[PDB]
Structures are given as C-alpha cells and as structure tokens.
Amino acid sequence: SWPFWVMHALGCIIDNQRGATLSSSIDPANGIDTSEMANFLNMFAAVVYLQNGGLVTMVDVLNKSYQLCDPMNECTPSLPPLLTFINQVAQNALVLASPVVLVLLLSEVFLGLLSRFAPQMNAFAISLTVKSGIAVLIMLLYFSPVLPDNVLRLSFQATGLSSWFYERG
Amino acid sequence: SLDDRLLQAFSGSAIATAVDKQTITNRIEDPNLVTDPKELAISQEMISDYNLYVSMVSTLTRKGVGAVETLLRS
Amino acid sequence: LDDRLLQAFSGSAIATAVDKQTITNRIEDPNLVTDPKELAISQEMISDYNLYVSMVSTLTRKGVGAVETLLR
Amino acid sequence: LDDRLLQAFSGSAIATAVDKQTITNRIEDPNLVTDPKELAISQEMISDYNLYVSMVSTLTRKGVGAVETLLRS
Amino acid sequence: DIVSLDDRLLQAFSGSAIATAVDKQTLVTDPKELAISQEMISDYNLYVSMVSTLTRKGVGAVETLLRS
Amino acid sequence: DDLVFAGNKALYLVLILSGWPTIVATIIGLLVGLFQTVTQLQEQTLPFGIKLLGVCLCLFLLSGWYGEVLLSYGRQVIFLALA
Amino acid sequence: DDLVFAGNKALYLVLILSGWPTIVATIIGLLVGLFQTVTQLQEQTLPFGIKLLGVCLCLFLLSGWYGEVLLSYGRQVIFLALA
Amino acid sequence: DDLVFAGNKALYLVLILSGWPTIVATIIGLLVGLFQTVTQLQEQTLPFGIKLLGVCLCLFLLSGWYGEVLLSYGRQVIFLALA
Amino acid sequence: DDLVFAGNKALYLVLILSGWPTIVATIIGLLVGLFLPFGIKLLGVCLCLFLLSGWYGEVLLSYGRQVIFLALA
Amino acid sequence: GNDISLIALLAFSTLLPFIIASGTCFVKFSIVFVMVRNALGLQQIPSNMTLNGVALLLSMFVMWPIMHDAYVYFEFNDISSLSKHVDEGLDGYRDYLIKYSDRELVQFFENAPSIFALLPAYALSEIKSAFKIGFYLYLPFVVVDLVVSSVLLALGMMMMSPVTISTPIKLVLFVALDGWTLLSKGLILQYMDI
Amino acid sequence: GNDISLIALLAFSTLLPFIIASGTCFVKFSIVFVMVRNALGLQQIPSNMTLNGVALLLSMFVMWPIMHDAYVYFEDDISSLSKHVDEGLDGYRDYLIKYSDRELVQFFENAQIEKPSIFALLPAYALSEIKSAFKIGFYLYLPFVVVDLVVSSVLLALGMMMMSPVTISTPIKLVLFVALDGWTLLSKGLILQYM
Amino acid sequence: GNDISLIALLAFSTLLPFIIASGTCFVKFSIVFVMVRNALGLQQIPSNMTLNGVALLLSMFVMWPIMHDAYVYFEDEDVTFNDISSLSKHVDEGLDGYRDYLIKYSDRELVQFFENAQLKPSIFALLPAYALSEIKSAFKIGFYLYLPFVVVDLVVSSVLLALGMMMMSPVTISTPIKLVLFVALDGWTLLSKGLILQYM
Amino acid sequence: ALSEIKSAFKIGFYLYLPFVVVDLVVSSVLLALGMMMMSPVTISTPIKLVLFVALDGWTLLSKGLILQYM
C-alpha cells in the first residue's frame, strides 16, 4: 500500500494549508469527511499502477514470500527496519508536497505586511478567499510530473523480501 | 375486500378441514366401514388427500411470512 | 406481570411433571403394557405430551426473538 | 472467580473423560452387548452423555455471546 | 483409580496420531478394516472443519483491531 | 494515455468554474478594506454584506453556462470507459 | 423547465431572507462606528452590543413573514415532484 | 397558537440573559477609553483586564437569578408539548 | 445542596486566579509605558509563567480533589 | 384445537417484531428518547441498547390491557358466525388505532374501517407527533448556546469555541428538572387515561 | 432437570446482554468513563473497547455475590411453587429497591404492605441510575472549566487574541488529572457505593 | 480428543480481540501515537490505519513468545494426575508465565483492593488493575512531548507581534514548522525505540 | 477474476471523475463567504443527483456493458 498511502497523505496537507481543518477540530472534521483531495489523489494513483501492469507484481511477491519464508520455518519480520517505517512514509510525502506549500506561506506573508500599510484591511479573509486558487493553479502545473513517482520510485518490489523478513524468528 | 379476504380464506378453509377429519374418525368406527374392501379402498384415498392439503397450505403460509422478514429485516 | 408470570409458569411446570410420571407408571405395570386396549390409551398420552411441550418451546422462543429484534 | 472457573473446567474435563470410556468398555465386552438389561442401561448412558455436552456448549456460547454486544456495541 | 487420567485430557485433536494415519495410505476390505476406516474417515473430516474456522476467527480478530 | 488526460481536465475544470466567483469575491474584499483605511470607522459586517451580493449575483448569471460544461464532460468520459 | 425554476428560485430566497438582517447589522455598525470616530472613546463592545438589539427586533417583527414564505415554497416543490 | 408563543419567547430570553454582561463591559470600557486621555498614558491591553472583573463579578452575583428563569421556561414547554 | 456550593466556588476561583495577572499586567504596563530587545522581552514574559506554575498548582489540585470527593459519596 | 387455527397462531408469532414497530405506540417512545440525547449533544451515551430497552418496557404497560382483553376471550360453527366471532375479537384493537389517527388519511386508504387502512394511517400519525415533541425539547437548550456565545464576545475572545464550557450547563439544567421523571410520566398519561 | 425448567433457563441466558445493559450498574459505570474522556476533550483515546472493557469487569465484582447466593437457593400445588420461586428473587429485588426511586415504583405499580414488583423496579432503576451519572459528570467538568478560562486571561493579557488557546490547555488538562491520580480515585470510589 | 478441551479453543479465539484490548501492551503503544499526531496539528496524517497497524505488529514481539510458551508447557506427556484438585493446580502453573508479566507493571494497591472486593493473585483483578496503569502511563509519557511544540507556537506568535503584524492567524505559519522539525529529526524512530525498550 | 476486477475498477473511475468537480467547487465557494463551519455534503448531494438525472444515467452503462460481450 505504500505508494497509495503516500499519495493520500499528500492530499491532507494541501487541504489544510489551503482551506479548512477546524481551528479547534471540535467538529472535528472539515472539508469532506476524508477531504476530497486526499480521496481523489488516492484513487488516481491506484488506477495508473494497475495500467502499468503492477497487478502482476503484487501476486509475484506473494509466491516468492512462500519460497524465502514458510510457516514451518517460523518466518518473522525484521525488527530493525520496522522501527523506521513511519519516517519513510512521512518523509516521502513531505518532500513531494513541498512545491505547493511554500507559495502559500509566501502569499500569506505578502498580505500580512500589507496590513501594516492598510491596517483595518482584513488580514484573514483576503488570504482565505485567495488560497483556494493558488493551490489549484500550482498543482495543475505539476500534475504531469507526479505520475512517474508512483510507477518506479515508490512501487515495492520482490527484491525487498531479503531484508524486511527473516526466518526462524 | 383485501382486509376481508383473510377472514373469508381463514374461516372458509377452517370449516372445510374440521368436518373432513370428523368424517374420517367416524369412518373407522362403523362395523360396515372398517371391514369391507370397498370401504377400506376409499379410506386410503380419503386419508391421503387430507394429508396433502394441510401440507401445502402450511408451506405457502411460511413463505408468505418469510418474504415479509426478508423485505423488512433487509 | 411478575405476579402473573409466576402463576403461568408454576402451573405449566407442575402439570407437565404429573403427566410424565403417569406414563412411566403405565409402562411398568404388567396389566397395562400387555393389554391392547390399555395400549391404545397409552399411545394417545405419549403423543399429547410431545405436542404440548413442543408448542411451549416454539412460542416462548419466538417471544424472545421479538424482543431481541427490536433492541438491535 | 478465576479460582472458581478453574474448578469448573477441571471437574467437567474429567467427568467426560471417565464417562466416555465407560461407554466404550460396555460395547467391547460381550456379556454386556448381548443382554437386554445391559442393552437397556447402555441406551441411557449414551443419551445422557449426549445431552450433557450439548448443554455445556450452548451455555458457553451464550457467555461469550453476551460479551460481544456489550464490549463491541 | 478409575482411569489413567493424564495429558490426554488437554488436547482437542491428536494431530500426531492423525499424521500417523495419513502416511498409511499410498476395492474394499470387509468388515474389520471397513470398521477401522470409519475412524480415519471421520477424524479427518472434522479436523479440516476446525481449521477452516480458526483462520476466519483469527483474520477477523486482526481486522477488528484495525477498524478502530 | 486516457487516464492522465482525463485526470488533468478534472483539476482544470475546478479552476475554470470557480474562478470568476472567487475573483469577484477577492476584488470586493480589497475595496472595502481601502475605504476603511480612508476613514476612522472599523466594522466587520460591512465587508460581508458587500461581498454577499457579489458572490450570489455572479453565480446566478453564470448558472446557465455551467450545465453546458458538465454535460459535455460527463458524456466524454463515459465513452472512454466503455468504448 | 421545472428543474431550472426550482434551482433558480432557491438561490433567490437565500438572498432575500438573509438580506434584511445583514443590512440592519451593517447600517447599525456604520452609524455607531461613525460615532466612535466622533467621540474620543473607542470600544469594540459598544457596536457589538447595539447590533444585537437591532437584529433581534428585526427577527421579532419579521418572524411571521418568514413563516409564510418558507411554507409556500415547501408546498410548491412537493406538487412539482409528484405531478 | 402554542408554538408561536414558545418560539417567540425563546428569542426574547436571549436578550434578557445576554443584556447585562454586554452593558457591564461597555460601561467599563467607556471609563478606560476616557481615562486614556486623562492620564495620557497608554497600553492597548488595559481594557481587557478591567472589563473581565466586571463581567465575572456580575455573573457571580446573578448566578442565582439566571437559574430560576431557565427552570420555569423548561418546565412550561414540557407540559405544552406532551399535553 | 452541594450543586450550588460547588458551582459558586468555581466563579469565585476564576475571579481571583484571573484577577491577579491583569492587575499586575496593568501596573507593569504603566510603569514600563511611562519610563536583543526581543531577547529581553522574551525573558520578561516567560519569567512570570514559570513563577506562577507552582502557586496555581497547590490551589487547583485542592479543588479538584474536593469536587471528586463530593461527587462520589 | 385445529391445524388451521394453529397455523394462524404460529404465524402471528413470526410477525410480532414488525407489528410492534409499526402498529404500536413504541414508535413514539423510541424516537423521543433519541432526540433527548441529540439535544444534549451527547453522541454515544446512553447506548441505544438502553434507550430502546426502557422505551420498550414503558410501552408494555399501555398495551397489556389490550392484549389481556384478547387473552380472556377466545379470540361459532359457520362462515358468517365464525367471521363475526373472529372479527369481533380484533375490534378490541380497532378502537385503539382509530383514536390516534386522522380521519382524512383513513378515508383515502378506505378507497385504496378496515384494519389494513388503519395500520399505515396510524404509523404516520404517531411519527409526526414525535417530531412535534422533539421540537419543544431543543428550545430550552439552544437559548443556552446563544447566551454563552453572546458573553464571550463581550470579553473579546473572538475564537474560544463554546462547547468546552457550555456542555456542563446543559447537564445541570436537565438534571435539575428531573427530566426523565417528567417525560416518562407524561408519555404514559397520554394513553393510560389514569 | 425438568422439561419446562430448561425453557426458563435458556430464555434467561439469551436475554443476559439486555438485562445487564438496562437493569444492572453497568449503566452507571459505562457512562462515567466516557464523560471523563470528553472532559479532557480526547476524541479516540482510550478506545471504546478499553472503557467498556473495564466497566464490564468492575461490574462483575459487584454482581457476582448476587448470582452465587441465588444459585445455592435453587440448588437447595401451584400456590407452593410460586411462593418458593419468589424467595429466590428477594435477594435481587432488595438490590433494586435500595437505589430505585421510591415514588416512580408506586407510579408504575399503579399503571400495571405491598412488596414491590420487579417490572415496576426495572424502569424506575434504569432512569434513576442515568440521572446519577449525569450528576457525577457535571462535577467532573468544573475543575477544567476553571483551567480553560484562566488560560484565556493570560493570552489576552499578552494580547494574542487569535492565538486560540486549546493547544495550551490540552496538556495542562492531562498534568492535572494524572497529578490527581483520577483513574485510581474514581475506581476506588465508584465501587464503595455498592459495598 | 477431549470435548471440553475443544470448546475452550473456540471460546478463546472468539474473545481474542477483546483480550488484546486490555490485557496486552497494545493498549499503551497505540495510545501514545494518536496523542502525538493530535499535537502536530494535522489530522489523519499518518492515517489511523498506519498507527493501529504498527502498534499491532510491535506488540506481537512482546506477547507472542509468552503465548508460545504457554502451549508448549501443556504439551509435556510426562505429567500424570490423580485428583480433580491435582488438575486445577497443574493448569494454574501454566498461567504463571503470563501472570508474572502483568504483576510487573500493575500497581500493588489496586490489585489488593480488588482482591478484597472480589469476596462477598487472581487474573480478574490483574486485568482491570493493569488496564488502568497502562492508560495512566501514557498521559505522563505524552505530556513531556507537548512542551517543545508549545514553545514553537509561543515563539512565532511573539515574533509576529514584533513585526507589528496584527490579526494574522498564527496557525498557517506554525503547522508546517512542527512537521519539518519533527520529521527532519526522525522523531518517529526515537519514539518507537523508546517504547519497545521498556518491555523488550 | 483478477482481470474483470481490474477493468471494473477502471470503469468506476470515469464515473466518479465528473462528480469530483462538484465537490471541490462547492467547497471553495463556501470559503469565499467565510462559511468555514458549513458542511458541503449537505449541499453538494442534490447537485450530484441533478447531474445524474440530466444524463441518460443507468441506461448508458447497461447498454455499453452488454455491447462489450454481444
């Protein structure tokens, strides 16, 4: 699932930085109940993976697992790599989303200093109306180059079974 | 109509079955009817026909309430 | 009502136990199991017991199932 | 509680082991297979064993049944 | 003592014995061996019927802890 | 391929349809902000009352076109899925 | 057709029924706000308090009219759907 | 009818219960807005301090009267609905 | 009834525990108003939050225990 | 005892949980208790296992007198007489549905009184009444939510959300009224006619 | 056993989860734990399987003495049996009477010295326990509502009117409750009401 | 084999998801993660399915050896029994493998109180006496992880007031800084190691 | 089985794709007015139905699906 989990969390960052998660999350939700970008990008990344024939790779790791590992040899996960797993998923998503966050902060600072020069001009709403445009324009400009990441960079492969698992644990 | 079809069907059928077994019991308690092949031959027909009637009406009533469970529980 | 439930239950249990015993006593008495006319009376008692207890079981359990249903 | 549940388990785990064996030894011994009195008595033991285990199974399922709807809601 | 109460009181299926039986196998033989077959025919039909269920329980228990 | 193309258009449509209502909402916001700094008044209902009219008004005038965009895209994607 | 009329009228009512209370809150804020530009005293609570009184009086006097309007539209759409 | 009274009575209670604290805060704010010109020394946080003790002090004193009113309206509506 | 006592005390608590900061924040505001900069103002604000962490602790845990005691018995 | 009478006796015991869900006042009680929970803003507690339980027990008192009148009665040997005899039994229940249903609905259903026309007309009559009660239950608390919001804006707390402090006020008010004792009494009085 | 004795035993063992959820203290225990979670403002911690797990255990310690004392009595004409059966419930009936509201019992008894009837006690008990849980919860909110208002005064004394406080009071709410050993006090106290 | 030894198999696997929810360390690990997510601002990052997944895997390392040991104990054929009481004590000797684990973390005064209330150590007193301590331990361990994020918010909010930049909302700015500061330092590894090391 | 599932999932995507627009657009417009507390699902639901009814709906799919095997 790793290639999908990365693309999903990528969405949740954008929805917050752009729009709303309730400041106190008393509701707690905001946006849609699985905010709609993070559901859209999750679906999109899956359909492309199947088309590249990835489905044959998913079944391939299963058969190999049974040959490198089998129940009467008490196969077991490697503890050392499992401890690092959560950072890898977070790090991959954090870097890919970066191009869209930075412009949002810079734009809020642009308006922020303006409320020195026109002080009763409302700081908040004039940024809140605007952000939902700047987020979409900048995503469209990078929508094409996101696809190559799903196919090759993030896709798991049967070669990894040598290090994540060990027998007689 | 619809509300009374159940009374007509229930009431009309109850009287028809009640009298049929009654006409069977007393058919097996008459010296002329229990000891004559012409009387035993008919009794073999009579007793079986009653058996089928109750079996069909009982079955179909259960399917009636079964559809009402299905459409309402699911 | 609880005042009536104890009454409905009590009568049921006693009336059934008496019947079970009666049949048993008809089987051990040699004058009854050996007499064809006494057997015909016994055949009826055996059947009547079966059908009564079966009806109580069914109707009781469907009364419990009506309560289960409405709570879930 | 637990010290009481352990007593219930062990007492029944042994009574069934002994009762099941008693039925077997009555069926392999010829003087007990072919005598009507001993046949009459074996008919009782078989049915009583069957009922006893069926009842324990039911009542146990209900115990781990009431826990499902209360914990998981 | 009544009977030899021992560790045979603490298992459901005697898997070490059943394995012993299924290596015996590579027409009928009647009635002696036809009787013994009644055990090996049933004991294997019941063992499978349990294994099909413990996996469904065990998978479902993992899924219950993840749903929340 | 027919997936990346169809995916691009979904993001493209969002920017198009919502563009005008967000733009007009933005301009109206700045105007009230400028008019306030011109004087000593300080009010927060004023920007909302002015923007409410503008946002509802532009959608109302545009409502006829939105259906043209969506009804064509819906047929386009259904053909690719089943062709 | 029956779809456009109902969809168009929906937006119309939102603009009318929400219009009155937002205007009075706006008008009151400006007039009380200007006074705060006149007097040397500045306080956020003054305009906020006064607005509530005017808004509540508005809801009281119009409470009855708001009822008829919502019922008329509620009835009309039920007939349009079932006919 | 019964509904209009209960529906109208609700909005009235909101003004009665919320009125006092908005007044107490305002009346204190006017003193600070004025005193900023008498002492001619200023720090913008001054009003947030003093106004707080007015409101809290009034609530403690009125905590009793606030209860009796809600307990009467609560019972009244229950009787009207179920009757 | 206890509901009235436990309720009145809460309002009394806020008046005191919230009163002290605003009076001293006023006087300190006046004196400094009448009379690296970030580094100094940083120490000045953080300084009073450390000091008051303790005196507030002794109070609140005395009130929290008492309302629990009232509630359960 | 007869087979056909028994079949009709077994079948009614299958359909019980549906008739009690539509044909009996249980619908008012179940709805009212859930609306109480929603007005307080509580989301899991008390459980639907409890509310659907207590509502069921209270409704039992109201219906028991109706079932016993059919219990004490046999509920005679001809189609016309048998129909009259069987029909005369249900009439003890007909007098109930007709007292809590609107004439105009029944009349429409009488043209496609009959029992089948009374069942659906009765259901819609009890449901609309339940919402008529719920509405009144929200009024005493919504004013509390507005009052809390109103005062905080005096303090300048633009965005301290209310719920962290208003929720306990809702509980004291409901408890101080002994709500459950008033609601459970008034609901039965509508039917028991004590 | 006896044929009709099975039917009574089997029906009862089916309805266990409803009787415990309505008539037993499990009602009081289950609510109080959820109110503590919400007073802290936690959304998911601890899981409903955790809290419901505890309420179901602590309740067993309280109820077991009743079931054990009852079993020994059943192991030990129509008019004689009914009177014999009722004495077995008296051990349970007493428990409900202790807590159930005295007037509701009479009010429901009239709808159905007189010894109360269980069917009158059940609804009178269920409704009376709920009220007591809402009452306890109210007391558990007051110590934190003081915390929440106090923090706001600090931010306002520093002018940070759009520094929404909740991030800052959430960890204070935890320090307070663990420094109060709440989970221990509630568990010891809540049981002593039934001893 | 033995029928009562069969019923216990099916009951156990039916209760297993509720036992793991109280009598196992899964309780502590999963809780700490959700609080750390909660304090980082963004919500459902990682997804709930991540957190409850790793907590489930990491916990098996600690419990699975104990379970395996319990079954291997009963398999010894060399034991013999002569009475009902002799069997009860023999069974109890097996559970000591698990009891010893609960006794370590559960507090003495809770167990002693329940062991008295139980009348009119026992596992039924060690389950609730354990569940309450593993909960409590998490609110302590977590509170220390809120301190640095509070500092970050106060600093930037004060910086904003030094620039004289009023009514900007100090959340857009600080949310991303918390993640970068925490993710760039591999916080999730240091956190996970600190948990396993208490029990392994 | 795996092959039909893969293809079925592709068809599902194109049918979802037109409704995403309605959700993202309605959500953006709400923030324009500052109604950050409103929940779009309550508003965007009727818009989805209107679009589906204006298209040929299920008649398009049922024909298209059969034609792949007829």
Author numbering:
A (entry chain 1F): 89 to 257
B (entry chain 1N): 28 to 101
C (entry chain 1M): 29 to 100
D (entry chain 1L): 29 to 101
E (entry chain 1K): 25 to 50, 60 to 101
F (entry chain 1J), G (entry chain 1I), H (entry chain 1H): 2 to 84
I (entry chain 1G): 2 to 36, 47 to 84
J (entry chain 1C): 2 to 76, 82 to 118, 141 to 222
Question: What does the publication say?
Answer:
Many important human pathogens including Salmonella, Shigella, Yersinia, and enteropathogenic Escherichia coli employ a conserved, virulent type III secretion system (T3SS), also commonly referred to as the injectisome, to deliver a pleiotropic arsenal of proteins into target eukaryotic cells. Chaperones present effector proteins in a non-globular, secretion-competent state to a cytoplasmic sorting platform complex, which sorts and loads effectors into the export apparatus (EA) subcomplex located inside the membrane-bound basal body. The basal body and the needle filament, collectively termed the needle complex, function as a continuous conduit for effector protein translocation from the prokaryotic to the host cell cytoplasm. Besides its role as a translocon, the EA also functions as a structural scaffold onto which the inner rod protein PrgJ assembles.
In the apo-state, a unique loop of residues 106-123 of SpaR extends horizontally out on top of the M-gate. Consistent with the recombinant EA from Shigella flexneri injectisomes, SpaR residues Leu110 and Ile114 (Phe110 and Phe113 in FliP) interface with the methionines of the M-gate below, creating what has been termed a plug in the structurally-related flagellar system. Intriguingly, our apo- and translocation-state EAs superimpose with a low root mean square deviation (rmsd) of 0.49 Å (SpaP : Q : R), revealing that in fact only subtle conformational changes are needed to facilitate substrate transport through the channel of the needle complex. In fact, many residues involved in substrate translocation localize to loop regions, which together with low rmsd values between apo-state and substrate-engaged structures supports the concept that the basal body rings and the bulk of the SpaPQR complex provide a scaffold to position critical residues in the secretion channel. Our data confirms the M-gate forms the main constriction in apo-state structures that shifts just enough to allow substrate passage while likely preventing unwanted transport of other molecules. (3) The SpaR loop, resting above the M-gate and blocking the channel, extends upwards, assuming an open conformation, which together with the surrounding Q2-belt creates an interface to engage the substrate. Six PrgJ protomers interface with 1 + 5 SpaR and  P proteins and previously unresolved lipids, together creating the atrium. The lipids reside in a circular gap present in the upper EA, where they function to accommodate SpaP α-helix α1 and stabilize the helical fork of PrgJ, together forming a nucleation seed that drives polymerization of the needle filament. Notably, the lowest monomer PrgJ1 has a unique fold, which extends horizontally, interfacing the SpaR loop connecting α-helices α2 and α3 before traversing SpaP1 to then cross the gap between the EA and the basal body, clarifying earlier reports in which this part could not be resolved and PrgJ2 was speculated to interface in alternate locations.
